């Protein structure tokens, strides 16, 4: 819903059809954005999904 | 150069048009968006396509027609084609005292008849300017006094210079014969020529 | 992003049938700097008088696509010319090397319901520029067959 | 604009559909799963398609028809048509005093006649909102006194804003021609234009 | 939802199936080795394909059929199709006291009728489980006392949980209407609708 | 398994081939040399192809037929057929006491009846070994008393081991269906299944 | 060499064209400009194409015909044909004393009969120069006493050197076969070769 | 091996050739230059193609024909085909005392008949050498005393060694049966075999 993309390649034809190639990026990874991220404190855990008898 | 028809040459009744096909050729780039809206784009010009079919031809009729077609292909002229169904005489008078204001490049001709023309043109008739060979069809006509408002299907191929004179009767299609690269006619054992077709295209 | 005049957007939204025309103003070579001439062409079906410049319509057949991306590079565009024209066949064949590095300005122009040009670009109130640059080489391909219809296409290349 | 027909121009009885094909065109992302289940997703908008075939047209009738069609091609607007098989006036009255409560999306619709309309719209009849030009098709009907519950095959394209008025009669399809690029008419030696047909397509 | 047939709706005799086409669709990868041995590989599922043809339809018959089809396309339901030639009543009784042992995933159903069912099913009949919509054909049947050994063409699409109940009579195909993307019917000048065909596919 | 036919099931006279096409399929590396000589190398194995066409089948006969065919498709075994035109019992007797000396490869074969068989197998008749399921075709015959010299069109697929017994009657082709993937049957309003046909193909 | 025909071999009336198709083959670089103007450039040489169809040929007549054709294929020379519809001897006299002044290129040609020829070559007739084997077609004629002005459809391939003599009678097309690669003849049980036809093509 | 015809086997009248098709297959590389000159290049050999059609065949006629064809396919021999229309006996005598000078590799045979042969061969007849199986057609024949000058369509496939002897009568085409990869014949319910065609090619 209104996902943020960035144009990367616009092509104009004589028929009017315009070819686009957007580019998706992470979150708050732009120079203009507020790069401060507070959600990384919860470190992921190890995947020990096997157990002994 | 005029294509032989039973108006100028009634002695060859086989030269009549057994069936004409006035093809509307207006190439457009049509795109249908997923939101249900169909969109068109027009760049190229519109040219009237005429297809003529002929019956069995006797040796003299075929000789005359072939001589005319070879004369065309020799001098590289332009075949003129007359359609009888479009020869209804409505507007009569002099077309030299009528004036067309200049700068008209749209799809509509506004002309002051100056009261010199009797009758009124009907929608769907054939209309043509005197300085350009392109043939137009009147799609609408409103008369408010002496000034006429004629609406044409093909967008005006020329910008009026003020010297053009409308032509309503005696209109001919300045066609160029297509399919002339491989043009032939088989002669049957009974002496009549068969399989003659003229695919003409309006080369303005 | 290049914004366009409000009336331009209104016309583009409301009207589904657009009669576009590509106006070409090609630079013509001159022996000395004392001369400067241009040849104006368009693919529309009638001559377009834009800014007092008469764009004739007989010759140009087709135009390629202009493409760019976020990395600087020398984009290229190629447009074709009818090879049955004597002027252009002579020009390409016997002067196609002196044409190198000669400018060209292609405009994408919408033609109103009347013959006037819809003022899309707000900076000049004129057409929206489509391409600009210099020629780099050319090419003609005569293709005849002893049976059928031959072909003769002049292809220009631009950067 | 209006497509000519014997209702608008009774003096031309040659106009009028010899046969009309009302096709249903709903694009869908259909997928045939390996387990036997068929999954289809509706994304692209649906549009009615109208294929009109004309009987033998005399020269004047065809002149009127192609004049109107060329005016269509010139001014570039939409071309409205009125299918006569759906012209059974099964609902009398004036629908201005009929209110459709706002905030309704989907196939179902609720409208209050306020005791004004006389006649029950049976399933299979057409339906069209006053503002939007889309044409729906009633599939089921159920009324509790004055309030009417109507189910339409295509989902409501726009959510009702509380002012849209029902149109149970004189429904016109806002269509666009699909045969314009190459549209030819043949004239026989009998004097009639034969095999005139149109492939219309509802826009938006 | 049931497709209208002259069982439920005899007042519309034109809705009968002029000709049905039960298509066996079981895609397989067949490879022929040069040593003369032809080898097959089966991965995808088998689905019964039903094709219905109709005669000329009067306005009321077409109105009913079109209303039902549009209701289908609106609610996204599943059309149920009944084939009269497969409605021979052989097995009669209660199918609730019969037990099907669980864990049967092959191409064969072993069921203990518990003496509650009279008659015996015939080879080539239609058989279906009560908990799955897939339709099976009995290819062989051997009865040894009360336990029946019914052999089915399509490999069991479900593993029996022990609660399924065999269904022998009143079997309907849970089909989904194909070719609905471009669905139409031409109305002739004589008032009857022609060119109506239903290509249905069993969407279990 | 056995394909049903009036010999196995006389109660169904609708079964039985309306027309059978016994095609010869020998792939070959044919090469057309520039000097006019045609060189062909036989590498791939030869296989008879059987195209069976059925007359109007009534519902019960088709039920039996497609039940048997679906049992074929289920259990996956081979489908034997008996061509009736080659069922002329031209050789009486029991062939168990007929010995075929071991170590024989190629078209020619030598078998000793030991004064048991009565009747001469003329050219064009079928022949099949007891062990291998391949079906040959006698092209020439020559006997010197009890010993018979038979020439077969396809070379002996396996070299005789001294125990293979001749089978001059009741020869069945071990075939596989080639129409299984999409096999539909149409039911007419007359009450018969029309145009039922099979494209069989001998396996190994 | 000469293609056999009833004029050269009257004893074989089966020879002779049942129908002859004289096609015109002028390759051209045609280009359809966007403004409506059609521009075509003539570069490749023009060549008449002759399609000859024969009636029912009896075995001896076909033996003569294919003997002559195989001699053609063997010695590799050209194959002359004489179209009989253009054999109207409309110009009497001997043309040796007729001079064509040198240095003439293009369609027009001027020749001085010096009061020798009797008869006027009307448009549509054939014409051929003594030296070059090309065959032209008169399109228009105009004479002022003895001097004749003739316009030919194909431009003069070679410029007149002052010695070329007109050939108004007995004009032969220097053609080459185009059906040689696969040319088969079927013999009926009635005893006649049916459907013998030739696709000739003028060389140079 | 000789193909069965009603000369050797008149008891099977259905084995006659209902229609033969002697196809001239001489592949060439034909190129048409823009200057109107058509140029050919020949590398590969010319092979006579024979196509045989058959009427409905009774069981015995088909049995005989199929036995012969299977014998052919078994021994890999060469079918010999006799055309009755080419069996006119003109040259009679001994062909052993006639001498052919060696070193003749062109498309022409010069032979000294030594006065031992009566009659003269006619153009279009069939001619063959005794040491090569290729069949030639005489395109021209001039006799100056005892030495004959026979001209042949196919260029001599062998260089004469001086031991070859001309063969004029009893000439057979050493053909090899094409389309034998998929060769079959459908047996109708009335007992007659239909759809039998032999596409033969001269495999010298």
From Swiss-Prot, chain A:
Ubiquitinated by the Bil antiviral defense system when this protein is expressed in E.coli MG1655 strain expressing the Bil system. It comes from the Viruses. It is found in: Virion. Induction: Expressed in the late phase of the viral replicative cycle. Forms the simplified baseplate, together with the p132 collar protein, the baseplate tube protein p140 and distal tail protein pb9. Closes the tail tube and, upon infection, opens to form a channel thereby anchoring the tube to the outer membrane. These changes allow the tape measure protein pb2 to be expelled and phage DNA to be transferred to the host. Also forms the start of the central straight fiber, which is continued with the straight fiber protein pb4. Homotrimer. Forms a pseudo-hexameric ring. Interacts with distal tail protein pb9 and straight fiber protein pb4. This is Baseplate hub protein pb3. It comes from Escherichia phage T5. The lineage of its organism: Viruses, Duplodnaviria, Heunggongvirae, Uroviricota, Caudoviricetes. The gene is D16. The chain holds residues 687 to 739 of 949 of the full protein.
UniProtKB/Swiss-Prot annotation, chains B, D, E, F, G, H:
GO terms for cellular component: virus tail; virus tail, baseplate. This is Distal tail protein pb9. Homohexamer. Interacts with baseplate tube protein p140 and baseplate hub protein pb3. It is found in: Virion. The keyword ATP-binding does not apply. InterPro entries: DTP-pb9_A-dom_C (IPR048416), DTP-pb9_A-dom_N (IPR048417), DTP-pb9_B-dom (IPR048415). Keywords: Late protein, Viral tail protein, Virion. Possesses OB-fold domains probably serving host adhesion properties. Forms the simplified baseplate, together with the p132 collar protein, the baseplate tube protein p140 and baseplate hub protein pb3.
């Amino acid at each position: 819903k209104d996902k943020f993309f960035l144009v990367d390649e616009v092509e104009n034809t004589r028929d009017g059809k315009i070819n686009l190639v957007l580019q998706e990026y992470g979150e708050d990874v732009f120079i203009n954005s507020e790069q401060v991220d507070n959600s990384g404190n919860d470190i992921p855990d190890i995947s020990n999904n096997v157990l002994p008898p | 150069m005029r294509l032989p028809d039973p108006y100028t040459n009634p002695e060859y009744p086989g030269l009549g048009f057994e069936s004409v096909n006035l093809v509307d050729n207006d190439p457009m780039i049509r795109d249908e968006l997923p939101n249900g809206k169909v969109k068109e784009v027009k760049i190229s010009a519109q040219y009237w396509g005429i297809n003529i079919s002929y019956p069995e031809l006797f040796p003299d009729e075929y000789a005359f027609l072939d001589s005319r077609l070879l004369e065309y292909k020799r001098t590289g002229d332009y075949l003129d084609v007359l359609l009888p169904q479009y020869e209804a005489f409505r507007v009569r008078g002099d077309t030299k005292s009528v004036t067309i204001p200049a700068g008209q490049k749209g799809s509509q001709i506004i002309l002051n008849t100056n009261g010199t023309l009797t009758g009124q043109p009907k929608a769907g008739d054939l209309f043509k300017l005197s300085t350009h060979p392109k043939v137009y069809k009147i799609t609408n006509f409103s008369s408010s006094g002496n000034v006429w408002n004629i609406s044409l299907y093909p967008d005006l191929f020329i910008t009026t210079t003020g010297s053009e004179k409308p032509v309503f009767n005696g209109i001919l299609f300045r066609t160029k014969l297509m399919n002339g690269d491989s043009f032939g006619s088989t002669l049957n054992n009974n002496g009549t020529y068969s399989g003659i077709s003229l695919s003409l295209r309006e080369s303005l | 992003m290049k914004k366009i005049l409000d009336s331009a957007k209104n016309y583009l939204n409301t009207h589904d049938k657009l009669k576009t025309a590509c106006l070409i103003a090609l630079e013509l070579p001159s022996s000395s700097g004392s001369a400067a001439t241009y040849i104006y062409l368009t693919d529309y079906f009638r001559d377009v008088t834009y800014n007092g410049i008469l764009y004739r319509s007989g010759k140009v057949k087709s135009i390629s696509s202009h493409k760019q991306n976020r990395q600087l590079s020398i984009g290229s565009l190629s447009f074709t010319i009818t090879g049955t024209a004597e002027d252009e066949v002579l020009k390409l064949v016997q002067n196609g090397v002196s044409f190198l590095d000669r400018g060209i300005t292609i405009h994408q122009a919408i033609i109103n319901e009347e013959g006037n040009i819809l003022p899309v670009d707000p900076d000049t109130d004129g057409p929206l520029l489509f391409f600009r640059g210099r020629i780099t080489g050319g090419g003609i391909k005569d293709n005849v067959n002893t049976s059928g219809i031959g072909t003769s296409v002049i292809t220009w290349n631009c950067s």
